[PDB]
Structure formats: C-alpha cells, structure tokens
Design a protein around this ligand. Structure first.
Ligand SMILES: [Mg+2]
Ligand SMILES: [Zn+2]
Ligand SMILES: [Zn+2]
Lengths: 121, 99, 50, 1166, 73, 89
C-alpha cells in the first residue's frame, strides 16, 4: 500500500511559473491562495469576544471572575489546576469546583446569555 | 459579481477568488490616471493600499468599519515591499531614508 | 483559546475532532436534483447509498 | 529633541551598491545546504534554503521542535532548535546569505550594455571576459617594468614575462584579478590626470571622450560606492516565503523557480569548497569556478548568457531580474493593475427614471458590497447582539436588514467605471438606488461620457471606504460636478438621441394643424390645450410668455410680450429656468442648439440650475418622443423618381469615354480618371436628388391649394434633428451607395448602383465585403494606436501640476482666428475664451482699455470684444508661464467641468493627455500618425531649409554634391556657409536679401529650425495649428491648452552655450537653469549667468529623463534603470506621481497637494 | 562562452598517457609518499605520541578503529 | 442629499482644500467627539459637514480656532495632575 505513499513523493514539484491559459501573465502561482491568513470577519470577532468575556466576567463577584480567569487562560499565562486555586484562595479543594459551576450557571440563564450565545454556530 | 472581503493571493497578498467568491475588480493603470485627473488622492490611496495590498491595513480597516470610524492607517503596500527584498536579493542595497 | 475554552464550557458543546468540508450549493443558484453519481477508489468499501 | 532610531515615517529612498559586510548585515544565517524539506515530515531541513533556524517558524508563534508551543513565549529562542517563536510572517521578511568561495562577477554590472565595470576600468568587455573565463592574464599595479597596468597577457607571455621580473610585476586572472583591479583603482588621482590632459590637449575626438568619462568617475566617487563591490563575495538569499514550496491537492507540490536556481549556486559553490581541500588540479577548480559564475548569473538575471531551463520542464527558469521586470511591456504591478476588495461588476441597463446624480444598483451586489458597513450599523442600533449574529442575519437575509441597507446607502456614493477608461470621466460617482435585479441601471445622460452603449457593456463598481474618499467622491467624482468636458468647455451631458428626437418633434411646426392661430395666456394652458386633444403639438400660435433677463446688477428684469411661436415651444418653455429668453426655444431645437441651450444655461445661471434643467430636459424629451410614435417603416426611405435616369446618362458617358478609348482619343490612365469622375459626379447627383425630394417634399395646404415645408418623414426627422443618421448614411439607403475599392486601394469604376432599400446582388455584396472587413480591421488598430499615444502622452506629462498662483509674466502668445484661405475656419472668440489677457487691450481709439491686462475672458467679455471688431489678442500660455516646476493658474485658464478658474493643485498634465487621447479613436500626410510625428518632433523626410541669418546671400563654390550657400549679413560677420545639395530645385532668389528664417526652398520644415531660428512662440504656434488642423478636420474639438502643455513638456530641456558656473554643452532643464542664472544675477558672481539654447525634445525622448528613478524604472527598461542608478547612489526624493503610486502614498497633487506642501517644506528645514 | 566549450578546449590540450607513462607517474607517486612516510618515521614526538596513544587504547579511552587501519599484515 | 457642492466651493475657493476641511469636520462628527451645528435630516456626516460649509459656520480658520481653545480647556482640568509630576525633580 506504500505504493501510494511512495508513488506520491516521487513526483517533482511543478514550476510555479507554469503559464496557464491565454499565455497570459496568469501563472500557476498567481492562483495559490494564502491559507494561514485569517479572514477579517474572524479577526473582528476575536476582538469582540475578548470584550465579551471581559464584560461578562466583570458581571460576577470578584472571586467568580478570578476563578474563571484562573481556571482558563483569560488574560493570563497558562491556567491553574483547581488545587492551586484553592491554595491561592486559602479555601480549598471541592469548594472551588462548586463556585465554577455557579459561575457557568450564572452566565447560562439568559440575561447574561443572549450575547455569548450569538458567538457559536 | 461582487466582493467585500475575500481570499488572498499567497505570494502577494492581493485579492484572489478562491471560492468563486470572486476576486475584486482590477483597478488598472488607466483607471489610476483617472483618479489623478480628479484630485482625489485618498480615493486612490485607499484603492491601492488598504482596499488591496496591505496585509495589515486591510484588517485594521475592517475593524474600524464596523466600529463606525472611517479612517485608514495605511502602512506600506506589500507589492512594493516585495520589490524591495527582490532588489535587495540581488546585489543592491536599497534603503528608506530620513523621516 | 482561553476565551473560546470558556465559551464551550458555558454552552457545553464538544468541539469535534472533525471539520466540515461538505459540498453545498453556490450562493443564489437554485434547482432540482436530477442525478447523483458515486465514484470510489478500488478497495475502499462502498457505502450504503452508493 | 531626539532625532529617532525606530519607525517614523520616511522620506526619499536611496539605492547603492552592497558591501559584503553590508550583505551580511541583513543575513540571519548562512544557508549552507540545498536541502529544502524533510520529505517525510514535511518540515524544513536545517541550514537549507528553507530553514527554521535562519528564517522563521513554519507556523505562528510555535517552535519547530515543538518544545515551546505557547503564544506567551515570544522573544524565546528555543534551546533545542534555535527558532525565535514569532509569527510566520517573518518568514517573509528575514533574509540570508551565502559566502561564496571564489569571488564572482555580478551579471548586471558586467552585461548591462555599456558595461559599467568596463568603462570604470576603461577596459573592453571582451577582454574582461577573457580574464574571467581564465583565458588570459591581466597585469595589476604593474610597477615599473615592461608592462602597462591594464595590459593583458597570455600563458606563454606571462611565463616568459615572469622569468625576467619575479616581483614588482603582478598579474592575476579570473574574478580575483578584476576585484584586484577595482580595489587598486584610485579614482581621485585618475581624476587629476584626466583634468591635466583636458587642459593640455585640444581635440574634439580626444576631449569629447575625455570629459564624458571624468563625470562618471567623480560621480562614482561622490556616490560612496566602492568599486570592489561590483564583485560579489557574499550573495544574499531571498526570504523563503517569497519563493515558497506550498503543497497542492493530490499531494503535488509547487514552487518558485528561484529554488532551482538557488539550489544550483549552492551545490556548485559547495563543491568548490571541497575542491579546495582536495587540492584538485587547476583545470578543475577553474572549471568549477566558471560553473559557479554561470550559476550566479542564471540566478541573478537569466538570459544574458545561455538561459538555463527548469528541471524536466522546457521553459527557462525565471530569475530575480525577471521578477522585477514583470511583463506586459513595462508594468510593475502598480502599472498593469491590482485587484481590489470592495468592488464588483455586472451588465448595465437604462433606468430613465433616475436623476442625473444616481444609478441603479442590484440589491445583492449592494448587500455583499457593504457587508462590513451593515455589520456596524446593525450592532450600533442593537439589532444584533454581536458581530457574529450580524453576519448570520444578513446571511439569512432577515427582513430588517434591507431597511438598514437603505440607511447606510443614502449619502454614500459609489464609483462606477467602464472598460476603456480614457478621460477622467471614465470614473464618476453616483448615489445608489436599491434595485431588484442583477443589472446596473445607469443614467442616460451619462451614457455619452462613458462611451457606453447598452449592447451588453458591463461596468464595475467600487465603494469608497474612508471618509475622505466619501468627500473626495462627492466633491470631485460626483456626476453633477463634472458636467462639462475637460477637453473643451462644451457640455458633455447633452442629451443623446431619443431625447433629441423628442424635443425636435416637440418644437417643429407644420403648416396647418389643429389649433392653428388661436391665442393663449401662457404655457400652463398650452399644455392644457394639448393634453385634451384640442391643439396639435406643432401649429403656429401666438401666446403670451414672460421671460426674464438678469442684465441688471445681479438682478432679473421681467418682460411679458406676445410671441409668435408654436404650441410645442410654448409647452417646453415651462422648463427653462429664469434668466433665459424665450428666444432660445422658439426655434426647431436641433441637437446643436439644444446643447448650447444647456451651455448658456450653465454660463448664466450657474451650476445647480443646469443640473436640474438637464434632468427635466431628459424626462420631457423621452416622454414627448414617446408620445410622438416615431417609427421607421420600409416606406419611410424614399428613393428619387429620377434615379434610373441619372444612372443611365452616366452610363452613356462611360460608354462614350470607352469609345474614345476604343478610338484612342484618350489614354488609358486618363480614361480611368475620366469614368470615375462622372460616376463620382453621378452619385453626388443622386444624393442631392433624393435629398431634395426627401427633405421638403411634404407638400401641404392651408385654406388654400398647396404649400410645401420640410418633411415630417420619420427618417428625415432623425437625421435633421441630429438624433441619428446622417446624409451620408441616408444616401446609402435610398440613393446608390458609393464606389467600392479593390483591396490594393484602387476604387472601382462601376460603383454600387443598388442600395439597401433595393437588394444588392451577389457581386455587389461581395465587393462591399472588402471595405467592411478593412474597416473593422482598421478601427481595431486605430484603437490600439490611440491607446499607445495617450500612454506616451501621460508619461511625458504626469507630474506637471498647477502650483503657484500667478507667475506674473507679461509673456504670452498672440491669438488670431485660424482664417484658412477662406473666411474663418475657426474663430477668435473660441480661441481666447477662458484664457487670460497678456496686456490690456485697446479699442480702435486708445486710453480706452476694454479688458484690463490680466483678466479672465469669460462669455461677457468675449462678447464685448466681439461687440468691437478686435482682431488680435496676446494671451498667457502654459508655454510661457514663468513658474518653475509647474504652471501658474493665471497662465493656464479657467477650463474645468466648472467654469471657475483652475484651482491650485489640480494636476493638469494628465487631463491634458487624456483630453488629447480620448478623441483619438475618431481620427483617421494626414491622420493620427501625423499627430504622432508632430508630438515626436520628427524631422520630415524631404525638408525645406531656412535662412540661418538675415542679410544678402549668394551661391558659392560649385557642384561637389553640395553647392555652398554663402550668407553676407549687412552689419554682422558673413562666415555662415551651408552645404546645400544642388539637385533639389531651389526657391530662394539668388539676388535678394533674406531674413533669417525665410523660405530658402519649399517642402516641410523641421520644427527644430522653427524653434531654433524663429523662436519659441513660432514653434509652439506651429505645433498647435498643425495637430489642430488634423483634429478639427476630423470634427474634433480640443482646446489649444492641452496641446500647449504637451509642448511645454516637449521643450523642457535646453543646451547651454555660455559658461561661468556649470559646464558648456550640458543639456539641461530650463527650470533648473533659469533658476540658477536668476540666482546668479545677484550675489554670487555679479552676473556670471550663462546663456543657453532651447531644445526640442519629442515626447518619447523627453519622457526619458526623470529625476525619480522609481518612476523611470516603471516605464523604461528596468535593468538599465536600476544599474545606472545604483552606481550613482541616486537618492529618490519621490515628489512625483508615478513614484508615489508605486510606493503607495498620497499623490503630490490634488488632495495630497496640500500634504506634500506641508512635508516638502518640513524637509530642507529644522 | 558557455563553459562546456571553454572547458572542453582547456582539457583537450592534455595528451593521453602512454601505457608506460602511467606507471612512471605512479612510480613517482610512491616516491613522494614513501619520502613522507620515512620523513614521518624519523620524528621522535611522532613515536611517543603513538605510544601514548596506544596506552590510551588499552586503557579504554579510544578504539582500535580510531588509530590503525592495520599493519603490514 | 447634497446634489451639487458648488455652493461650498464658493465658501472656500480651492475646492480641494474644501474636501479636506469637510473631512476633518465629518470626523469631528463621525467619531463622536462633537455634535452637529445645524439640523441633521438623516443626512450622513458627509453631507452634514457640507451643509455646515455652505452656511459658513465651519471652515479651516474656525476649526483651527475651535481646536486651539480645546487644547486650553483640557490644559485647565489636568492643571494639578501634571504639575504633580514635579517628581521629575
Ligand atoms: Mg458595445
Ligand atoms: Zn525548539
Ligand atoms: Zn505663468
């Protein structure tokens, strides 16, 4: 079955200058789109989703915002295991997991919910 | 055909239809002269920089358009920016002077 | 990303290991399907419809 | 203050040669291996053309090895595999280099045609190559022995020469020698030596070449380039992403050709490094060295030696020089075009309902075009929670968005453009009106300016985004602001065809018609009579009208009277605003008058009324034309009753002349002309026969027996009105059509006796084909020539812009009407309109200033000049404008689509070029090529000769092949003797005194003379009139202005004669020069000021010299432009148009003219 | 130009070796080398080094493949 | 709409310096720093600015004049804050 793999790599790259059609300056390379780019309708929504999560995280109690920003990478390097957070809060372990739930729960039922739901599809 | 924001050519960042959501209309030499006869520079600048060739300016514009601020923070057309490396890839030292 | 991770967390969607490549009708054009053909590489099991 | 070290906003640019250390400055790593990507993991192989270490991470913010994958880590160089984790964008920026083993020559400086290295060493090319291929030895720094410094030796000679002197004699071969030569070269000392020889020895052959070279050397000195640098030690490598390897579907790969090239230079280079440590024999390392040179040549500019071909693919691989050139002639991707977002296009249709300021735009195009704008308004009002949802809404086409689109559209112009953009009117701004359907609807009145028929022409649309583009669009590109052709002040919005048929059918009168003779209070009740069926549209009727005249001081007089008119003119009067007299509508209203209606309306009431007037004219035109029911049937084309008879008589004549030829009474050649003459004459007869019958034969009765007026026949109404058709085309319909011509150009003596109303038979049609086919062929080529001409034209002008206000020179040219041989082939009033007077002009008595010095002559003033009999006016011209680096507006004129005097900063050259070029399609020595000869200054073929100097002349010496002409000035010195071939029949009287510039023979004259001998005004007058002869003969209106500015650019250069500051024979700018002797007349030398001589450069030649090298690199040959600049270290300051577009900043004209001003002064400031 | 030509002609000068000439040169080769071997054989530091190196080989600080290619035999 | 801008070119002669000034003003309106000087009909800021030019209550002198005052209006508020930057000493 390696025939396929082997048979593939054997093919020599095509001159990107291959004239195609019309003999015109259309050259094979002129048609190769850029895929690492990011569509602006996307780049735009990122700047918005930040502002979104940033607003709704101010809508909670200060510890609910920190705990969620903690539990995820929000405006911070990495994210913290839930044990670390307990030590940071001096109130530890199972307790914290609960707060997370109510926070997600609090953003779930719409007053809060109408804006963040519009981000998916 | 109409296009707002489409795909882009890799080698030069330029509008390119890849989806058959068509690449923009081509603004050629003659059309440029036409803008030069009117005195409209900004129309012309926006045509060949942010509306097209500036990989930065293009997104920076869109974000302002939705924000409702019509401006352009143009930067340098990437086409020319490549010419610069191409000259410099030869033996030529080409620099951008002063301020 | 972080805020995306929170987004799935609130609305509880499992983000798939798979992306949608499906062929869909071009914008604005509308019609009736008069036919479907299925070509398969020799050796992959032909699916049900095919 | 701190100057700066980081990214502020640059001015100018510099270009120069590159040091090896300089090349190393850029390089982030040495590319040491041809490997590209791993072949299994498709990852880049380290130290290869694609390298993560040298250039950059493959994917954004991620280490190659993968140890550091986090966006947090940024200035981190991975400890595993060094990659500073940063956007992959940097793979597009960072360069690299290659340290070559044995020096290598740079193909550009070896082979651009005047080999720079060659003349820098003053050494021939073939010799240098002979040293490069190791085919011969060259001495270097020869010392005192036997041998010259640049002398070249052979093998034996080197050997023999070495036995005598071991040292104090030196020779190398190959690239190192040349590098050795260049490094050793002392330019300054060479300068001095060349200076001494200049003073000592006098010979034209000798000092010509001498002075030429010394400038280059000191130039190169002043450059800062060191000659060794023309020889490459280090070779920079272009960033990978600019010659990418990207994959394709099916797993195939595609890549730039440079890799194939680059790969080779490395291999060959590396093999050489090996071959040194193996101490291989010379024959080999030499061969390897040659191969290395070849590879670099193919990399840099391929095609100057062998043209290496790509792998497995015949087509030659493209080198960096071919990357810069691009193709389609000279186009650097600013010039051919650039794709642009926010745009679209589709087929266009009519839309008569539109006001002139708007256009029909399909709903969907408008949805997709404004998508980002819509998103912003949608969440501004909060109809969409967030941007994503907004997309989903419009993608869903929820009913609410359409209303939102009406908001964002309202005040927001769009640009509409058609395919061959010629004059600036090819792009005009409109206000969008949402339209169901996929077609663009376009205001009819504008269809003329675009040259857009409705046969399926497509137009493209562009959304101006930035606010300044909205305001530029509204105040510049809006339709209503350009209502007048820039080529000539006549309105370009004049109604076209249906509308003019309407108004003609409206105001026309038959002899007897319903309502004839009655009387009405005013137009209101005139329409009331018409709509009701009581009165005919055309019947002679008296009605009371009230016209107005503003002839008071800014004030409208009113007068009411009983005008004898028709019903139609009465009805139409409702539209004419204010000022205008009823006199304007009381006529038949043809297309010509109907335009000047608009014109006067504009020149009197101003802009706004002309627009709104214009809208009204169209609406009413279509409408009544719609009421008229004009049509065309087959019986509307009336053949003369006498046709067969005319043909028969002319048929006797040909048979008579044939009998005269049968009897030899007339020669064959004489016969051909003879038969053609009668046939030509016959056709004219039939034409003016059918014309008489067709035109007036409506013969009608009022209360009496008969009377006859001009026909109401459909097709005549069309041609008379000016709507469509012309006596010529009509003549082919009814009267016989023409005498065709056989392909070789003779014209057949049996014309086409039938016409289209009858049938053409087999033979006749077949003969028609040749003329037809040649027309299409001819037109398509005259199309191309026109385009070519406008190109050269904008190139020679372009950067010319109105800059100062009034240069304040009294200087100018004397304007007279063209008056050719008969009476007035074109008047004075048109020539002087809108120009500015050079000096106050007199009545026939004096101390009576009618128009006082420089005053814009507008319509009233021209009429006051017209009131009086004044026959001659001196007028300021751009050719005489004293301002340097531009034109003073006072010297230019008023012209614009607006009547006001030209604004400061409008770029006129372009509009000049465009104005001349657009009509060029309609032209056809004589023809368009005649125009080109003129603007190209070309000296005619069999020219005349003009008296070099005044005074009595005589013939001298004898027939050697030239019989010398000896001139004897009265006061002055005689010595002028010109060599005139005596086999050309002369004119000049052997015994008469001749003024310099008189006609010494006949035949055309080179404008060089006219400029040189007769002076500037003469040649400029000569140019305008000859080209204008061509256009006006073709029926084209082009103001002399435009032609005058092209001339100014033609004479841009001059050649010094005297001295006292700069060099003798230097050709140079009169702007530059005049500014230097105007600077020299004081301070400095009391006056050392040097005398010059104006020169005539053809456009294509004058366009060649431009200070900005980026501009020249555009349209000229790039390689030559870049090199010749790169040696001199030429520093482009921009300042021009072409160049600012390339780099992409504001044009130093128009809107930007304010900017450049603020920066240009900031520059050369502190 | 086109270096195949300037090469073909540069080597084309060299005359093919006679069957005897090959051996002559080859013999010459032997001499040159044989001189340096002997020239090498006469150096004292050259021996003690080899000695000091073999003491490192028996001491497990190197391998036999990294010192000799074999002797005569 | 503003069908023809002819009236504005009269208020400032050049017609190019006209485009700039109305732009500058339109941004004073589009980016919300200020509010209109004359009834807005749903005319977008593009035209609102043009109406303001025609009426002669907005040109480059006035704007430069207006702007120069705001510099001092803000220099008055922060007066204590920046003089508190005496820590430079
Ligand atoms: Mg057509
Ligand atoms: Zn790493
Ligand atoms: Zn002037």
């Amino acid at each position: 079955d390696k025939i396929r793999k082997v048979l593939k790599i054997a093919k020599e790259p095509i001159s990107m200058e291959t004239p195609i059609g019309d003999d015109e300056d259309s050259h094979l390379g002129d048609f190769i789109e850029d895929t690492t780019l990011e569509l602006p309708l996307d780049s735009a929504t990122t700047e918005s989703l930040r502002a979104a999560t940033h607003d709704v995280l101010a809508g909670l109690t200060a510890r609910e915002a920190k705990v969620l920003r903690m539990r995820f990478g929000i405006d911070m390097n990495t994210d913290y295991t839930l044990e670390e957070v307990g030590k940071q809060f001096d109130v530890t372990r199972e307790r914290i997991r609960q707060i997370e739930a109510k926070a997600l729960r609090k953003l779930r039922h719409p007053s809060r919910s109408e804006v963040l739901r519009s981000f998916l599809d | 055909h109409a296009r707002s924001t489409g795909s882009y050519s890799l080698v030069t960042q330029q509008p390119l239809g890849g989806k058959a959501q068509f690449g923009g209309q081509r603004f050629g030499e003659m059309e440029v002269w036409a803008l030069e006869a009117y005195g409209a520079a900004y129309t012309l600048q926006e045509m060949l920089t942010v509306k097209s060739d500036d990989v930065n300016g293009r997104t920076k514009m869109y974000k302002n358009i939705v924000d409702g601020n019509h401006q352009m923070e143009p930067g340098m057309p990437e086409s020319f920016n490549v010419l610069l490396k191409e000259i410099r890839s030869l033996g030529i030292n080409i620099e951008l002077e002063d301020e | 990303t972080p805020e995306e991770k929170l987004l799935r967390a609130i609305f509880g969607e499992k983000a798939s290991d798979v992306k949608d490549s499906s062929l869909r009708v071009p914008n604005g054009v509308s019609g009736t399907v008069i036919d479907v053909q299925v070509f398969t590489r020799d050796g992959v099991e032909k699916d049900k419809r095919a | 203050l701190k100057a700066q070290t980081k990214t502020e906003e640059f001015d100018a640019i510099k270009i120069a040669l590159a040091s090896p250390d300089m090349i190393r400055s850029w390089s982030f790593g040495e590319v040491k291996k041809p490997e590209t990507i791993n072949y299994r993991t498709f990852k880049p192989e380290r130290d290869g053309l694609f390298c993560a270490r040298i250039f950059g991470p493959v994917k954004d913010y991620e280490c190659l090895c993968g140890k550091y994958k986090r966006l947090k880590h940024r200035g981190v160089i991975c400890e595993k595999c060094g990659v500073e984790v940063t956007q992959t964008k940097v793979r597009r920026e960072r360069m690299g280099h290659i340290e070559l083993a044995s020096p290598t020559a740079h193909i550009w400086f070896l082979k651009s045609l005047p080999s720079r290295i060659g003349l820098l060493l003053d050494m021939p090319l073939r010799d240098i190559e002979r040293v490069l291929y190791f085919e011969s030895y060259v001495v270097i720094e020869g010392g005192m022995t036997n041998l010259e410094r640049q002398q070249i030796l052979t093998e034996e000679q080197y050997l023999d020469a070495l036995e005598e002197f071991g040292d104090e004699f030196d020779a190398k071969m190959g690239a190192e020698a040349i590098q050795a030569l260049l490094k050793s070269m002392d330019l300054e000392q060479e300068c001095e030596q060349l200076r001494e020889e200049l003073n000592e020895t006098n010979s034209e052959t000798k000092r010509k070449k001498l002075t030429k070279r010394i400038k280059l050397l000191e130039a190169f000195v002043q450059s800062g380039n060191k000659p060794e640098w023309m020889i490459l030690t280090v070779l920079p490598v272009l960033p990978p992403d600019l010659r990418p390897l990207v994959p394709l579907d099916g797993g195939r790969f595609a890549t730039s050709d440079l890799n194939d090239l680059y790969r080779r230079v490395i291999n060959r280079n590396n093999r050489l490094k090996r071959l040194l440590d193996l101490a291989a024999p010379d024959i080999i390392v030499r061969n390897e060295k040659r191969m290395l040179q070849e590879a670099v040549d193919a990399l840099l500019d391929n095609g100057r030696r062998g043209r290496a071909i790509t792998g497995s693919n015949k087509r030659p691989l493209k080198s960096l020089a071919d990357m810069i050139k691009g193709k389609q002639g000279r186009f650097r991707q600013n010039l051919l075009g650039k794709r642009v977002d926010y745009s679209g296009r589709s087929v266009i249709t009519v839309g008569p309902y539109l006001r002139l300021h708007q256009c029909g735009l399909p709903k969907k195009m408008a949805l997709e075009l404004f998508k980002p704008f819509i998103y912003g308004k949608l969440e501004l009002r909060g109809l969409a929670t967030t941007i994503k949802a907004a997309k989903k809404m419009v993608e869903r086409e929820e009913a609410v968005v359409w209303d939102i689109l009406d908001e964002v559209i309202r005040e927001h112009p769009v640009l509409l453009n058609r395919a061959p953009t010629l004059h600036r009117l090819g792009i005009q701004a409109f206000e969008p009106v949402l339209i169901e359907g996929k077609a663009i609807q376009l205001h009819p009145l504008v269809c003329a300016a675009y040259n857009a028929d409705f046969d399926g022409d497509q137009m493209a649309v562009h959304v101006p985004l930035t606010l300044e583009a909205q305001l530029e669009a509204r105040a510049l590109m809006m339709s209503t602001n350009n209502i007048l052709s820039p080529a000539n002040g006549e309105p370009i919005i004049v109604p076209s065809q249906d509308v003019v048929l309407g108004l003609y059918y409206m105001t026309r009168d038959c002899v007897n018609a319903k309502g004839e003779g009655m009387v009405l209070t005013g137009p209101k009740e005139a329409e009331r009579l018409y709509r009701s069926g009581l009165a005919s549209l055309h019947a002679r009727v008296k009605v009371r009208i009230t016209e107005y005249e503003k002839d008071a001081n800014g004030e409208l007089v009113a007068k009411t009277s009983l005008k004898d008119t028709t019903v139609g003119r009465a009805i139409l009067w409702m539209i004419v605003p204010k000022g205008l007299p009823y006199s304007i509508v009381n006529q038949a209203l043809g297309k010509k008058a109907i335009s000047k209606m608009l014109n006067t309306c504009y020149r009197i009431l101003g802009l706004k009324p002309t627009v709104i007037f214009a809208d009204q004219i169209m609406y009413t035109g279509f409408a009544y034309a719609a009421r008229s029911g004009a049509s065309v049937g087959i019986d509307d084309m009336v053949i003369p009753e006498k046709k067969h008879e005319i043909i028969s008589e002319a048929e006797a004549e040909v048979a008579e002349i044939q009998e005269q030829f049968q009897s030899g009474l007339v020669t064959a050649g004489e016969r051909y002309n003879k038969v053609i003459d009668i046939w030509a004459a016959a056709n004219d007869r039939v034409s003016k026969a059918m014309m008489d019958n067709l035109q007036t034969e409506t013969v009608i009765n009022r209360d009496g027996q008969e009377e006859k007026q001009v026909s109401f026949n459909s097709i005549y109404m069309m041609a008379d009105s000016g709507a469509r058709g012309s006596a010529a085309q009509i003549r082919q319909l009814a009267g016989m059509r023409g005498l065709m011509a056989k392909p070789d150009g003779s014209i057949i003596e049996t014309p086409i006796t039938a016409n289209f109303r009858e049938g053409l038979n087999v033979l006749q049609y077949f003969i028609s084909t040749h003329g037809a086919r040649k027309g299409l062929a001819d037109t398509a080529l005259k199309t191309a020539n026109s385009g070519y001409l406008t190109r050269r034209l904008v190139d020679v002008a372009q950067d010319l812009v109105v800059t100062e206000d009034d240069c304040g020179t009294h200087e100018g040219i004397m304007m007279t009407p063209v008056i050719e041989g008969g009476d007035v082939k074109e008047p004075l009033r048109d020539r002087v309109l809108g120009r500015v007077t050079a000096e106050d002009v007199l009545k026939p008595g004096t101390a009576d200033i009618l128009v006082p010095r420089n005053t814009l002559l507008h319509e009233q003033w021209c009429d006051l000049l017209e009131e009086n009999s004044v026959d001659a006016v001196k007028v300021r011209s751009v050719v005489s404008c004293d301002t340097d680096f531009g034109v003073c507006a006072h010297c230019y004129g008023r012209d614009l689509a607006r009547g006001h005097i030209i604004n400061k900063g409008e770029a006129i050259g372009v509009i000049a070029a465009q104005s001349i070029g657009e009509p060029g399609t309609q032209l056809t020595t004589g023809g368009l090529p005649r125009v080109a000869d003129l603007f190209e200054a070309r000296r005619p073929k069999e020219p005349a000769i003009l008296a070099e100097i005044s005074g009595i002349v005589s013939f001298g010496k004898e027939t050697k092949g030239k019989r010398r002409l000896v001139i004897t000035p009265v006061d002055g010195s005689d010595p002028y003797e010109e060599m005139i071939p005596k086999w050309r029949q002369l004119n000049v009287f052997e015994g008469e005194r001749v003024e310099r510039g008189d006609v010494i023979s006949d035949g055309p004259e080179a404008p060089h003379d006219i400029l040189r001998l007769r002076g500037v005004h003469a040649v400029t007058r000569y140019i305008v009139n000859e080209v204008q002869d061509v256009y006006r003969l073709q029926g084209v209106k082009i103001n002399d202005k435009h032609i005058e500015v092209i001339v100014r650019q033609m004479l841009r250069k001059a050649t010094i004669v005297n001295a006292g500051s700069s060099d003798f024979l230097e050709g140079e700018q009169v702007e530059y020069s005049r500014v230097k002797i105007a600077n020299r007349e004081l301070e400095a030398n009391g006056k050392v000021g040097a005398t010059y001589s104006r020169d005539l450069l053809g456009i294509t030649k004058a366009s060649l010299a431009t200070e900005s090298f980026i501009s020249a690199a555009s349209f000229q040959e790039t390689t030559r432009v870049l090199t010749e600049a790169a040696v001199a270290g030429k520093r482009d300051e921009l300042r021009g148009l072409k160049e600012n577009v390339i780099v992409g900043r504001l044009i130093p004209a128009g809107t930007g003219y304010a900017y450049h001003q603020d920066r240009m002064r900031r520059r050369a400031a502190g | 130009t086109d270096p195949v030509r300037m090469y073909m002609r540069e080597m084309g000068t060299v005359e093919l070796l006679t069957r005897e000439g090959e051996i002559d040169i080859a013999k010459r080769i032997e001499d040159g080398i044989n001189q340096v071997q002997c020239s090498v054989a006469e150096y004292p530091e050259a021996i003690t080094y080899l000695l000091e190196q073999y003491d490192r080989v028996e001491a497990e600080e190197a391998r036999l493949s990294d010192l000799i290619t074999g002797f005569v035999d | 709409a503003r069908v023809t801008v002819q009236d504005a070119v009269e208020k400032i002669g050049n017609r190019f310096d006209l485009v700039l000034v109305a732009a500058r003003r339109a941004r004073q309106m589009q980016v919300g720093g200020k509010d209109p000087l004359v009834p807005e009909e749903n005319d977008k800021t593009t035209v609102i600015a043009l109406r303001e030019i025609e009426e002669g209550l907005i040109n480059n002198q006035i704007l430069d004049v207006r702007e120069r005052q705001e510099q001092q209006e803000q220099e008055a508020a922060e007066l204590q804050a920046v003089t508190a930057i005496a820590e430079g000493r």
